Amino acid sequence: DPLPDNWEMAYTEKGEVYFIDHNTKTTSWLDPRLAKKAKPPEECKENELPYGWEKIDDPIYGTYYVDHINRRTQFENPVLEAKRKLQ
Amino acid sequence: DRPPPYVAPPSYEGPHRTLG
């Protein structure tokens, strides 16, 4: 379970976990311990998202997709988008 | 439209609840 060297975990005001990287002076939602193998989005399967991505079903705005690596949000499922565009 | 903007964790340069 332990973090890499010069990493701390912390809680937001709400008690949400995030990670502090003192090596690069940055914070992230992504757990460095859980760093999965990445893959081209078009190589994912059904209901599969690539590493870094999170599907948000927002009661106000509806479903959208969050990429924690690029710090981007978008509406299209990124796997379906890559598959679409590769046609 | 654009979806909701990316919500980052608290910025590094500041106080953190390091209570782990």
> b/e string for A15-52 if b means 16 or more Cβ within 10 A?
eeebbbbeeeeebbbbeeeeeeeeeebeebeeeebbeb
Q: Is the dihedral of CA A59, A61, A62, A65 positive or negative?
A: negative
Give yes or no for A39 touching B (CB within 8 A): no
The contacts of residue A66 (CB under 8 Å, 6+ apart) are: A53, A54, A55, A56, A72, A73, B6
Tell me if A71 and B13 make a contact (CB, 8 A cut-off): no
* Residue of chain B whose Cα is closest to the Cα of A59: B4
* CATH code of the domain occupying A1-35: 2.20.70.10
Other CB atoms within a 10 A radius of the CB of residue B12 amount to 14
Measure Cα distances from A8 to A25, A49, A81 in Å: 11, 27, 35
Q: Hey, where are the domains in chain A?
A: 1-35, 36-87
DSSP-assigned states of every residue in A5-36: TTEEEEE-TT--EEEEETTTTEEESS-GGG-P
* Residue of chain B whose Cα is closest to the Cα of A23: B12
Method: X-ray
Measure Cα distances from B11 to A12, A29, A30, B8, B15 in Å: 11, 11, 14, 8, 9
Judge whether A1-35 and A36-87 match in fold. Answer: yes
Question: Which candidate, B8, B7, B10, B5, places its Cα nearest to that of A61?
Answer: B5
Specify the fold of A36-87: Ubiquitin Ligase Nedd4; Chain: W; (2.20.70)
Judging contacts by C-beta atoms under 8 Å, the chain A residues touching residue B14 are none
Mapped onto helix, strand or coil, the DSSP state of residue A80 is helix
